[PDB]
Amino acid sequence: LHKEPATLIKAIDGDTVKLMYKGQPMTFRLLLVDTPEKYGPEASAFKKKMVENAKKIEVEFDKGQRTDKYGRGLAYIYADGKMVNEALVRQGLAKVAYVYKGNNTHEQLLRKAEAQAKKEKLNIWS
């Protein structure tokens, strides 16, 4: 997999973000995470801060289908090299979702993060 540059336009929700990608606006849905929205507001504020504070945002498509039926890019999003998808799960602000259409590269990574949050009774796991 490869990271590509993008620019933040707008944080939408814990699990969705609008980016300029290849010099057009596109909406991205985070791979392999389910966020609430309860911890919905907390999940959204965490996502928001992570992307808005980042100096560099990058998009990494997986090896599976790259867009959902709503036209959203399905990707791992990084802020300053740290994966947002992972960060949400590790913080107990998202659960790991089922693999969608072959996009499973970071599934074990995320499951590890989730197990740890759960062991810590953190946020959603409290």
Q: Which residues are catalytic?
A: 29, 37, 72
Cα distance between residue 14 and residue 34, in whole Å: 9
Is 105 marked as binding a ligand? no
Which distant-in-sequence residues (6+ apart) come within 8 Å of 66 by Cβ? 73, 74, 75
62 known member of a binding site = no
Q: Please report, as a single letter, which amino acid is at residue 39.
A: Y
15 is in an annotated binding site: yes
Q: Which of 79, 23, 16, 92 is nearest to 51 (CA)?
A: 79
Taking the C-alpha atoms of residue 106 and residue 63, their distance in angstroms, rounded to an integer, is 11
The DSSP symbol for 75 reads E
**Which residue ranges are tagged as binding site for Ca(2+)?**
15, 34-35
